[PDB]
Design a protein around this nucleic acid. Structure first.
Ligand code: ZN
Lengths: 106, 126, 19, 171, 250, 123, 118, 74
RNA sequence: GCAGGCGCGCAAAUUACCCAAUCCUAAUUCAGGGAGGUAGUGACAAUAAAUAACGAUACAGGGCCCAUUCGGGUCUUGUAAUUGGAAUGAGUACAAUGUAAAUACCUUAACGAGGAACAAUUGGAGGGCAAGUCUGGUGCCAG
């Protein structure tokens, strides 16, 4: 009750498939979305990954970590509904992957 | 040098905070409370329900100025004789007067809340 | 508390595979 | 250290900018440290004012407090009453630190050069080499500040660059 | 089997390692007796550490009140003397102004007696009378005029008594305990309750009376004749403010 | 040129030992070389470098003066008696060395505890 | 692993389950073990154990522990954080100190391996 | 033939923006922005400078008539 | 109990040194003591400092900054790695002190700076660019 998912701030989620591969407009809010299986509930929700250029790190069933989003305004292409961003993929922070410090193991 | 006004004195009495010891405990310095005679006009015109505020405004610590303007609009007299000088610290509790003061750049103002004065825009408050 | 536990029990979550 | 109540005011930001600028400081934490000890020193000074005159608690501890503050030098000896401790303020506290004091004493030509040659262990207060800016030289040891005996600005050997360049000019 | 909640009159710091010396069993209680280790190491600094304290005890060197007693944790406490042949010294160790244990420096003819408040007296066995004083000196055959809360002058060379001291109005008394610890004087009045809380009341130059329970205090002597040279010029501890006032005067 | 001074010279015939706080002033040297300063201390005292012993040094901040604790006394035989083994190893007048640090001698005496018998063994 | 050939290094990274990884702390890291680490990272990470040999840096044990903390930080940022590495000293009569060797053999005795999909 | 690792693989601070030598030293930027804030309020007010520097050869920057910069009392 | 580990396929002090200190125990100055002390690890808190300081010269003035409305004020503005010697400690290390021995601190020979490359990070706010791509449609636009 203390969070968008149970009470935890983060929850490991299994990526089903990349939403919006076939969106033509780059960096579009349909493009930077992904289906993810909550484990501690076991159900499928949809979530953001910022920077669709670094969308292509996470692909499929790679136990990503799922944090909150927190819309601090009213962006134009921003669809509602999603409040989950991706913060890590398979253990390593995908922000660190985007600024190419670390490496994704498999 | 702390300018005073009417709702500040009334709120200070109904919160039972003393004037000079309250200012010393809020600000940790000697404060000279200063009442314009144009604001003592309003504190007289409030009527007999505020005789406590009147005889606590009459106090030899609270040394009083002298105004020169027709009528008794204390808020405009306060904002005028502040933005002429920027040496005073305004004590108030009026919302619109607070907005005028925190619009003009860089005087400090204080207001009673809870059971002690709080001071807004002064750097060396601690 | 529940605060130091309900975030650390997600270390028990993974992808189900076989060995 | 002590954090302010509402730290992100533009008035307090310009305050910290001015104090750090004209006294040569390294962040806002120095201002907060000496502002915290100023706050505790006048919060301990005001309740002695609120209690009665010639209460021997007030008499003895007020004479103790102003005997300390005269010796540090933030309180001139013409104002030997306790309400002047209330009237004291924080630029008098960071005026007495060793960096600003040596810049006022000369021999440094800028506040940050004063800080950096203090940190190069060049300046000794009488006998002891001191390599910290925030020192608060007392009124007796004001006139004891000159360069260290083991410093090339004092009377020691010329430094590393000096003897290296003297050797290369010997070449 | 451990310590560091030591009685804070032992001048013991906190960063001297963890444990304090546990006083072994002996004459006195633990709360009012200091051991020879805390004496010879960090009270007059004749040694540095416990190894050399063991050296200067098993050198046959120390003699607490007439005998060697090679034991580091030996609770030689109140009213004892500690003689050392080298360094010429005899230490009657007593109380003082603030409460801790003041050393003396005592010559031989004052160092060849101590004195003791009697703790109880009975008839031991075979008709023989029976006196025990505060250090466990269970001594036979007193003079028959025995009271309790009473001072006997122990000869300390051979363990008999050499002199007897009664107690009434107008003869000195010295406190060991309470808030008023280490203080002399006896001249107000001799009040007694039943069930305790009674004291031989205490003089002052300004007639300041200190009343405690009668187990703590005991007689030194009489006016002009106390049987011990007294510490720090007969310490009554008037005031620090009166001390600074006398400093401004003279 | 250095200058070694002493202070709080208190005698102690309980160890026949004269103890003090020594302070050296070296205006430009790094340190004062414990052996060299103790033999100069024996020279300014009566005698016996081997029976003087100074042990508690530290150089104060900024250089120039070091302060430590110093023991002098007579009679090197009771210097062998009344001084600890590490200091008698530090000077060249005694030496003690073992091999088995803690665990090796610990397992050695545990093995002897296991054995309990003297030197008999058959096949 | 023969250390001159990616031709071997690739398939050893494919088949291996534990890799103990031989840095020399006298020299810091090298691109051979960085290459092997990335090959293992992309083909699926086996369980990695660092070991740092050639600790004959100098008498400067301050330099020794500074190089060791730089090595363990660069190791933790590049295999998982807080991974285990063992500091071997110089070789003594044909082989390493048996203390660290016995501790290493203890850890690989309790390693508890994990599945990878390939 | 001994290879090594070079600077980027050693430090691993890859793909950063352009940072600043000014921001490297947390005192210097407060020295070098107090210097600007000195020269900023040369424009806001007309702060005192030290008085008559040379001999008085004019204020060197103009004088205008229809402008009084003096605060009036209501 | 101490050290190290395990119980998940996703994780964090060393299976270090010593009775030298403080004490304790014993046939007892000594021996023992994973009580206890030291070291290593330790972005768990706390305290103090550095990551540069001082000049010289040459130029650009269509120059800067503060103004919600065409207002105000100032080389006493900026760039040139143009360029110069001074000073130092991170690091290095003879040594010496330190300690049971060693490490650490303090002290110190000789070294050790110019992009002082001996190369400070984390965020946040904004633009601008193509013979380029994609979408909408009242040309040349908008997204
Ligand atoms: Zn008015």
């Amino acid at each position: 009750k203390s969070s968008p998912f149970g009470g935890s701030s983060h929850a490991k989620g299994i990526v089903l498939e990349k939403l919006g591969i076939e969106s033509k407009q780059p960096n579009s809010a349909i493009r930077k979305c992904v289906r993810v299986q909550l484990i501690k509930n076991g159900k499928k929700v949809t979530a953001f990954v910022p920077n669709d250029g670094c969308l292509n790190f996470v692909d499929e069933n790679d136990e990503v970590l799922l944090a909150g989003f927190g819309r601090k305004g009213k962006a134009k292409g921003d669809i509602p509904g999603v409040r989950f961003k991706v913060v890590k993929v398979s253990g390593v922070s995908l922000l660190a992957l985007w600024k190419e410090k670390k490496e994704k193991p498999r | 040098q702390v300018l005073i006004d009417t709702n500040f004195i009334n709120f200070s009495i109904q919160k039972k905070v003393d004037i000079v010891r309250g200012m010393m405990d809020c600000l940790l310095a000697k404060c000279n409370p200063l009442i314009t005679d144009c604001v003592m006009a309003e504190l007289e015109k409030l009527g007999p329900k505020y005789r406590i505020a009147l005889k606590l405004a009459r106090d030899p610590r609270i040394k009083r100025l002298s105004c020169s303007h027709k009528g008794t609009y204390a808020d405009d007299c306060l904002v005028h004789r502040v933005l002429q000088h920027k040496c005073y610290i305004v004590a108030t509790n009026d919302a619109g007067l607070k907005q005028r003061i925190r619009k003009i750049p860089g005087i400090p103002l204080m207001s009673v809340g809870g059971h002690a004065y709080v001071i807004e825009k002064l750097p060396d408050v601690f | 508390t529940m605060q130091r536990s309900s975030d650390v029990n997600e270390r028990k979550l993974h992808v189900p595979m076989v060995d | 250290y002590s954090t302010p109540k509402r730290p992100y005011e533009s008035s307090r930001l310009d305050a910290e900018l001015k104090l750090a600028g004209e006294f040569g400081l390294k962040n806002k934490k120095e201002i907060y440290r000496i502002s915290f000890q100023l706050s505790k020193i006048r919060r301990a000074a005001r309740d002695l004012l609120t209690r009665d005159e010639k209460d021997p608690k007030r008499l003895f501890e007020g004479n103790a407090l102003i005997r300390r503050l005269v010796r540090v030098g933030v309180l001139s000896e013409d104002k030997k009453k306790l309400d002047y401790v209330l009237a004291l303020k924080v630029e008098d506290f960071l005026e007495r630190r060793l960096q600003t004091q040596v810049y006022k004493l000369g021999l440094a030509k800028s506040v940050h050069h004063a800080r950096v040659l203090i940190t190069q262990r060049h300046i000794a207060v009488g006998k002891q080499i001191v390599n910290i800016p925030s020192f608060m030289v007392r009124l007796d040891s004001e006139k004891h500040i000159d360069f260290a005996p083991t410093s090339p600005f004092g009377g020691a050997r010329p430094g590393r660059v000096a003897r290296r360049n003297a050797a290369r000019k010997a070449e | 089997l451990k310590r560091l909640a030591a009685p804070h009159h032992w001048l013991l710091d906190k960063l001297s390692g963890c444990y304090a010396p546990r006083p072994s069993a002996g004459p006195h209680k633990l709360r009012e007796s200091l051991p020879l280790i805390v004496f010879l190491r960090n009270r007059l600094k004749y040694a540095l550490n416990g190894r050399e304290v063991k050296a200067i005890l098993m050198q046959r060197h120390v003699k607490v009140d007439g005998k060697v007693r090679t034991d580091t944790t030996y609770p030689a406490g109140f009213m004892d003397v500690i003689t050392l042949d080298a360094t010429n010294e005899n230490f009657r160790l007593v109380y003082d102004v603030k409460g801790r244990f003041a050393v003396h420096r005592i010559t031989d003819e004052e160092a060849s007696y101590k004195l003791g408040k009697v703790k109880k007296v009975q008839l031991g066995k075979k008709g023989v009378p029976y006196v025990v004083t505060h250090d466990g000196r269970t001594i036979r055959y007193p003079d028959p005029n025995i009271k309790v809360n009473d001072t006997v002058k122990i000869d300390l060379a051979s363990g008999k008594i050499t002199d007897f001291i009664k107690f009434d109005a107008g003869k000195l008394v010295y406190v060991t305990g309470g808030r008023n610890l280490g203080r002399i004087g006896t001249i107000v009045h001799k009040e007694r309750h039943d069930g305790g809380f009674d004291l031989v009341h205490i003089k002052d130059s300004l007639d300041n009376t200190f009343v405690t329970r009668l187990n703590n205090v005991f007689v030194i002597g009489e006016q002009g004749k106390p049987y011990i040279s007294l510490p720090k010029g007969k310490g009554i501890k008037l005031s620090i403010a009166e001390e600074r006032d006398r400093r401004r005067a003279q | 040129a250095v200058t070694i001074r002493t202070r709080k010279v208190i005698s102690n015939p309980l160890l026949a030992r004269k103890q003090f706080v020594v302070d050296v002033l070296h205006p430009n040297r790094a340190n004062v070389s414990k052996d060299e300063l103790r033999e100069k201390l024996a020279e300014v005292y009566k005698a016996e470098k081997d029976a003087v012993s100074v042990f508690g040094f530290r150089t104060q901040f900024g250089g120039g003066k070091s302060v430590g604790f110093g023991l002098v006394y007579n009679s090197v035989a009771e210097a062998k008696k009344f001084e600890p083994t590490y200091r008698l190893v530090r000077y060249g007048l005694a030496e003690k060395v073992e091999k088995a640090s803690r665990q090796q001698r610990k397992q050695k005496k545990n093995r002897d505890k296991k054995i309990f018998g003297t030197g008999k063994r058959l096949a | 692993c023969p250390a001159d050939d990616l031709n071997a290094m690739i398939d050893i990274a494919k088949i291996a389950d534990l890799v103990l990884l031989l840095i020399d702390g006298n020299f810091g890291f090298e691109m051979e073990t960085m290459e092997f680490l990335n090959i293992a990272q992309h083909h699926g990470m086996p369980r990695v154990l660092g070991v740092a040999t050639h600790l004959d840096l100098f008498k400067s044990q301050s330099t020794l522990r500074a190089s060791k903390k730089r090595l363990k930080h660069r190791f933790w940022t590049e295999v998982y954080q807080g991974a285990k590495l063992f500091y071997l000293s110089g070789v003594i009569n044909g082989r390493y100190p048996d203390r660290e060797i016995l501790n290493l053999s203890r850890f690989i005795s309790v390693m508890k391996f994990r599945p990878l999909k390939w | 033939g001994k290879r090594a690792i070079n600077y980027q693989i050693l430090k691993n601070k890859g793909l950063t923006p352009k940072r600043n030598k000014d921001n490297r030293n947390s005192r210097v930027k407060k020295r070098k922005k107090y210097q600007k804030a000195q020269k900023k309020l040369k424009s806001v007010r007309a702060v005192y400078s030290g008085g008559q520097s040379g001999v008085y050869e004019g204020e060197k920057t103009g004088i205008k008539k229809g402008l009084t910069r003096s605060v009036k009392f209501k």
